């Protein structure tokens, strides 16, 4: 039992990413922003714009989600529709879930929302930027080594001894696979 | 007196002590109650054969009821389970331990073990802690069935300068400001 | 019709393509028959038009609202008003700062 | 700054110098995820936002709202919403035609 | 023991008569309006287009009244603004109350507010239009009659046998010498 | 059958007359004890310690609300009194419970008119402002002028009026 | 167009009067002290106690008044509140104006307030206990005759013979009327 | 010289009479040019163009007050009129400042006695509950009643009014 | 609970049941160390707490304020200092005893 | 990039089985039947009894199966619900699709519906019964090894050396350990 | 709710509710919209709402059960063609089900 | 002929093998051009414009369609290739209309991989859940694993399978 950790992320980067879709069962759903960085869970911090639309019989609740790059639907089916009513207009939440994709449009299919104070959202943009820039640096590092070089398996002792995760590598080579 | 230290998810291991840990709760295992002395306040055990409750540091004691609490908290490069004891799990939930134990009875009473009643009320009306910030305190075991768990002894709510101080300084690092 | 985030801008910096901003400020003159305050942030002053709820003097608010442009003249209808009395400005500022001149450059780096 | 009241206006005849606006009409199409619904009375369709609230399809409501004129076009910005299912439509023009046609009139008798 | 009856206006008018205070203590205050109409309590039917705004300390309560001829506050002071409790945003009401000044601007002083049936609006049209011209058609044959000849014993005895009320000609004075 | 008159021709002693206005004022709600036969004013005897209704022998007495209200029509301002369960049916509040609160403010130490007015007057004030049509005779009271004494109220027609408003304005000659 | 003049009162027959208000246009509201008199003006002389509270948007203005018999509220609603910044807390001030009711409390609607010195509140005094000795003896004149008949023709005459004032009768009998 | 009266004892054409009071209301404060030596009004002829007083000839007039205020004793109300010094006195204000503050309130678009009445009710509304001894003679207008036009005014002597209340007490018979 | 009424008294004779005082005075002594100064009533000398005003020899004064008596002594904490250097005192005391006559006989008769 | 097959089961092994739910991201969610059998995706015949509801936006849309031993819910969210379209009242279909639990009632995820023949259903009937015998005999000469020793290596390679699958001592040791 | 169990109309129990029979129409009635259905051991009048068999076509009908005075008739709620369809194999599983469910139910223990 | 085999079984490099399934997901649909003799695949060459089949010399070819989806029985999952008019049949929609509506497809910008998965999960979602027996070769591919390319496909026989499985009930022993 892994559980994968959620990234801070704007929502700009979810609205232009690329969505995988897994075909197996012991892999889930991701996507990959333009910047060459996997994501299975996202976490954003923004303002309530609208009341909660919940169905007559509580089947389902969403709710629009607003932080200064992006507005996005968060939604929730079956009985997490009960996080759509813990929030009401004008609120500063925080919302951690997974991302979806339904209609060319992604959307973000809530597991927790909670009110925060404003200088929780002033730390979510100061770490959000910290955690773009460090990426992009090692994305940028990393580009050449696949381009020159390929998939070897000394590509990949070079990719070791120069401070690159390995798993980048195989993101970078997926990114060109989808963009080609 | 021992000082604790900040220490990322990612690099934590089994054996640690005196860890400091700043994230997001993400996931709500268990809320449960149980007795326990009421001076020392430790697990005391209650026996069949006595009828009685034996603290085995001060005789025989009335027992007070106190909660666990079992959750889990992410912080953009881990996850790890966290256990809260006593004062602290109904100062993080607000629901004082009557009120656990009087709703695992009604639980229980629909015919549900020990384990669905805890998980079903923990699911169903603590749902709400989900997506706060805290930072915990405490000590990194590891658990043969369960993986590493970080029992705490203390929490508490962030503190917004600390933290972008922390951050302006990692910044720096980098070489941007 | 795709809806427009809110685009985080000064009183004396709105442009003529606007449709919607978020402003930060402090109240300086409240009008209740009309429905009506003033919202001061250093540079400039604005004559914010509520719909139901009107905020006290003296303390910080943040507005979101949309911006009506007649020969009337320029006035924010405000949608979304939240109390930021405890915030800290500041940093937000300092952010605001590095995010500005940081970001635009960042996109150009890497390719497909 | 008195408010200006609801002008009662039919869709086809929406003047340019009109401000707020006050329309009867029975929904023909609403659009969830942008929050809008087509407003159709006979003579016209008005495109009619809404900021939290939907009407259901095919009920008769009336909508007071104001106007945003922009090169993007002339939608209604609705404010009030109040359902109308029921009331008698034929008598309610009645009483507007003969108001409309005596009232003008009727401020010119007597002097001083 | 006696008690006035309230007359059906449109908002216009009220926000354009005269109004006159009494100094004595037997006697109310009034309003006396373009066409030289006596009116001591009023009654309307409208939109209430805001929101409520209730004091702290519940001493005070108001809210506007829009009809489609002009925009009006109602108000209530010490108990009355329990009033002001039983109506909210978007509500088509029937209000019943006096007729006061502040700030050179009309204001009700609430004594009932009531919801209503759309068909009760349409009454409320059809009954106001009606009362207005009768009123109308009386004061344009008293006119001519107070300008031609004046106040003397026999012009009471004119007006008297021509089917005009005697206190018409008083209003009509009295209004004359209001806007003189 | 009943004849539809204005308040201002109400003349005193008039019967089946049917009046439409608007609540203008609450006066008093109360309650009694009637038979459970005729639903009649009865007495209890102190020194019987029974309820004597003298058509019904002894009966167990059953509570009676009534409501004391006015009514204004732009011409004129009318009392009006209505009995029973239609003063149960316009308020929405079964006479018990009218019974029981009465009964609180009395233990207070409140005389019964004053509780009966300040009942009247903190709780049932949202009928003001409501249209009706009620229908009863009319009486001449010596310390209070003229009453109307209900037998049923009903909701306005609308449609009706707006037919009546337009056959007076065929008559006036505009339409 | 008749001013009834003002009466001279302690504050404890104020608070422990009885308030009757009126129900027809042409009447106003009035008090009936314990020793049958009829109040429509209270003229009081004293000193104030606290602080004047004045709402910031100056709708309503209230303070206390004390005089060493009871605490008294006086008011200002709407225009009135200008009266409301002429005291400042620890002087001598004169007060005339109405009587009201809230919430089962008696209070003075405000009319006009004046600074004063301290040998007329001594006035004030001898006035006032002059003023209740007189009203009293009266009052213990008109028990028996009351007590006597009734209001009947020949009290009214015999009354009238002796030097009462009619009006008495009538306010204990309304006296009588609300005692039971 | 002047007589005390009691106010419910007043009656249409008395003369000499001085009353002790306070205000109660203030009516109108306005201001008139009249001759500058006998104190009389004096009309701007239109067919010289000139402020005649037609007692003495061709002068040069000066500006008046004029005040008309409310005076109660508890016993009943009168109206009262102060003119020229008198009102100076009382108020404190030189008429001049009066005069400029009618003409701008006439300005904005009002009457005289709109502009009077509204400098009463705005500006002179501090001097009420105030303590008064008036002096004057009374008058009668058709639509006005009883007016005590006022010669002259000052402060209320405290022990004259205390030694005639304490031989009234006398009169009653308590000590 | 409404508040208290104020009672007049001397020092010679101020009484256990009073709560509020109003005293007529002369003073002797103003120590501003301490903010404290010595009222003389005729009768006795009372120690009077001056929050900020404070006044002067030769200026007879009237304190009306709350009374503090713990074990350390009697001092009046007072609210309210006003000038009366100018005052019928003895026409105060006539009255009050005069008051104090009739005032209990006339609550007394005329029942009901 | 392996797919679990899906197996064919009765309604009623479905209704009384136990869900069993994974906190992993790479595990998904499964059913263990009363006689121990893991189940991951189910594929049912039977015929429709109830007309399709379907809401108005077409977000969701479900319907009602029955064949003989109970009566399921058929569930499509968001895109899947063009599959409730294809059906109609009164016919055989063969319904495969997931396994998922809401407010104590089991229900499927549809994966895809298809109309049939009734031939159909009674090779499905006869496929369900010989696959419930063949299990059924396999948990019972399991069960003698899983009561002899527990999961220990001998019994592993004993159990393996008898015939007998390996996952199902942890099937019935995981049952074992949800009933107490 | 109650799952649909066949049987034949000879063998109707009255604690069962919900029928399911596989027939042969021999007649129908449109005015009251009855028609007969034979499944070789009996005749039974069912109540079609809106459908209509034809004579020729076997039809396999899912229905409540409406046991009143006025007589057995089925409130039909499917009806639905079997005539290419064999059965034999229907009663072999349904009597190979019935032998062998009790004591495979009863099987296994936890 | 072909030989009856079990998913459980299937190993690479087999061939004649039948299966019997259900499909379980639908992957791809797509056309493209082939020799109207040999119904292979013709290359376009650039230097000479014009589709060569280097076994018939030079031909005008014709399109024709292949289909990509997955099979299950219960004991496995096989991802299945059809080819041509078999294609056609089982789709029922005839092959210029997939090139038409892939073409259109593609027109909005989507390459031909992303038009043909659309055009699977869009229109042709209808199809899974229904029965078919295939006749095909097991070959291995290094990206996808095991893909079973169908010859033919044609409908399930009932009776047969209803005997096999009666067969196998015989060796488990029932009857
Ligand atoms: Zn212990
Ligand atoms: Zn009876
Ligand atoms: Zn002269
Ligand atoms: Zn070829």
Redesign the interface.
């Not at chain 1, 404003?118 to 943009?125: E, K």
């Given at each position: 039992k892994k559980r994968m950790p959620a990234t801070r992320l704007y929502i700009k980067d979810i609205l232009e990413g690329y969505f995988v879709k897994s075909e197996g069962d012991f892999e889930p759903n991701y996507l990959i922003t333009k910047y060459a960085r996997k994501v299975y869970r996202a976490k954003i911090v923004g303002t309530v714009v609208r009341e909660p639309l919940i169905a007559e019989d509580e089947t389902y609740g969403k709710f629009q989600v607003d932080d200064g790059t992006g507005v996005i639907w968060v939604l929730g089916f079956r009985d997490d529709t009960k996080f759509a009513k813990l929030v009401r207009k004008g609120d500063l939440v925080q919302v951690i879930g997974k991302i979806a994709e339904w209609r060319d449009d992604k959307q973000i299919l809530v597991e927790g929302v909670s009110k925060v104070h404003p200088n929780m959202w002033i730390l979510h943009r100061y770490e959000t930027l910290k955690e773009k820039i460090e990426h992009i640096k090692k994305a940028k590092i990393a580009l050449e080594i696949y381009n020159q070089y390929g998939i070897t398996a000394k590509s990949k002792v070079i990719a070791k001894n120069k401070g690159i995760e390995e798993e980048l590598l195989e993101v970078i080579d997926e990114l060109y696979g989808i963009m080609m | 007196v021992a000082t604790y230290t900040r220490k990322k998810?990612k690099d934590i291991e089994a054996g640690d002590r005196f860890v400091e840990v700043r994230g997001?709760?993400?996931?709500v295992y268990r809320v449960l109650t149980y007795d326990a002395c009421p001076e020392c306040k430790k697990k005391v055990d209650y026996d069949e054969g006595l009828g009685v409750w034996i603290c085995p540091e001060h005789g025989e004691v009335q027992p007070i009821k106190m909660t666990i609490l079992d959750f889990?908290l992410?912080?953009?490069?881990?996850?790890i389970r966290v256990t809260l004891f006593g004062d602290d799990a109904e100062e993080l939930l607000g629901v004082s331990p009557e009120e656990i134990a009087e709703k695992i009875k009604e639980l229980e009473e629909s015919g549900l073990?020990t384990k669905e009643a805890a998980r079903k009320l923990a699911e169903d009306e603590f749902?709400?802690?989900?997506?706060?910030?805290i930072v915990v305190r405490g000590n990194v075991i590891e658990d043969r069935f369960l993986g590493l768990i970080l029992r705490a002894s203390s929490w508490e709510d962030?503190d917004?300068?600390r933290?972008?101080e922390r951050?302006?300084e990692?910044?720096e690092k980098?070489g941007?400001? | 019709r795709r809806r427009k985030p809110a685009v985080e801008r000064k009183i004396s910096e709105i442009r003529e393509e606007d449709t919607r901003v978020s402003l930060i400020g402090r109240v300086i003159k409240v009008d209740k028959m009309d429905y009506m305050f003033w919202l001061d942030d250093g540079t400039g002053v604005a004559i914010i038009e509520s719909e139901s709820d009107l905020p006290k003097v003296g303390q910080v608010v943040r507005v979101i609202g949309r911006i009506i442009r007649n020969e009337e003249g320029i006035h924010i209808y405000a949608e979304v008003i939240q109390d930021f009395s405890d915030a800290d400005l500041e940093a937000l500022e300092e952010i605001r700062e590095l995010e500005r001149k940081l970001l635009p450059r960042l996109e150009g780096e890497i390719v497909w």
């Amino acid at each position: 039992k892994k559980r994968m950790p959620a990234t801070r992320l704007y929502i700009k980067d979810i609205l232009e990413g690329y969505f995988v879709k897994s075909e197996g069962d012991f892999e889930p759903n991701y996507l990959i922003t333009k910047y060459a960085r996997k994501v299975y869970r996202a976490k954003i911090v923004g303002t309530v714009v609208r009341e909660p639309l919940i169905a007559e019989d509580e089947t389902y609740g969403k709710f629009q989600v607003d932080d200064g790059t992006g507005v996005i639907w968060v939604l929730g089916f079956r009985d997490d529709t009960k996080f759509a009513k813990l929030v009401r207009k004008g609120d500063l939440v925080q919302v951690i879930g997974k991302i979806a994709e339904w209609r060319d449009d992604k959307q973000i299919l809530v597991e927790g929302v909670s009110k925060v104070h404003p200088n929780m959202w002033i730390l979510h943009r100061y770490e959000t930027l910290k955690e773009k820039i460090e990426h992009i640096k090692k994305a940028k590092i990393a580009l050449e080594i696949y381009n020159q070089y390929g998939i070897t398996a000394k590509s990949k002792v070079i990719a070791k001894n120069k401070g690159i995760e390995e798993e980048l590598l195989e993101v970078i080579d997926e990114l060109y696979g989808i963009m080609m | 007196v021992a000082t604790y230290t900040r220490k990322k998810i990612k690099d934590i291991e089994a054996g640690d002590r005196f860890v400091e840990v700043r994230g997001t709760i993400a996931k709500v295992y268990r809320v449960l109650t149980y007795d326990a002395c009421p001076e020392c306040k430790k697990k005391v055990d209650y026996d069949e054969g006595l009828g009685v409750w034996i603290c085995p540091e001060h005789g025989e004691v009335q027992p007070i009821k106190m909660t666990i609490l079992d959750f889990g908290l992410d912080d953009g490069t881990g996850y790890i389970r966290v256990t809260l004891f006593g004062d602290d799990a109904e100062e993080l939930l607000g629901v004082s331990p009557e009120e656990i134990a009087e709703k695992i009875k009604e639980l229980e009473e629909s015919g549900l073990t020990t384990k669905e009643a805890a998980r079903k009320l923990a699911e169903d009306e603590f749902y709400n802690i989900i997506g706060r910030e805290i930072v915990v305190r405490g000590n990194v075991i590891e658990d043969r069935f369960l993986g590493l768990i970080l029992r705490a002894s203390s929490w508490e709510d962030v503190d917004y300068r600390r933290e972008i101080e922390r951050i302006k300084e990692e910044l720096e690092k980098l070489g941007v400001m | 019709r795709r809806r427009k985030p809110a685009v985080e801008r000064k009183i004396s910096e709105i442009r003529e393509e606007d449709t919607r901003v978020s402003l930060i400020g402090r109240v300086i003159k409240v009008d209740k028959m009309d429905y009506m305050f003033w919202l001061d942030d250093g540079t400039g002053v604005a004559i914010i038009e509520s719909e139901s709820d009107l905020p006290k003097v003296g303390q910080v608010v943040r507005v979101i609202g949309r911006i009506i442009r007649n020969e009337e003249g320029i006035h924010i209808y405000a949608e979304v008003i939240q109390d930021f009395s405890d915030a800290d400005l500041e940093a937000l500022e300092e952010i605001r700062e590095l995010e500005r001149k940081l970001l635009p450059r960042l996109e150009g780096e890497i390719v497909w």
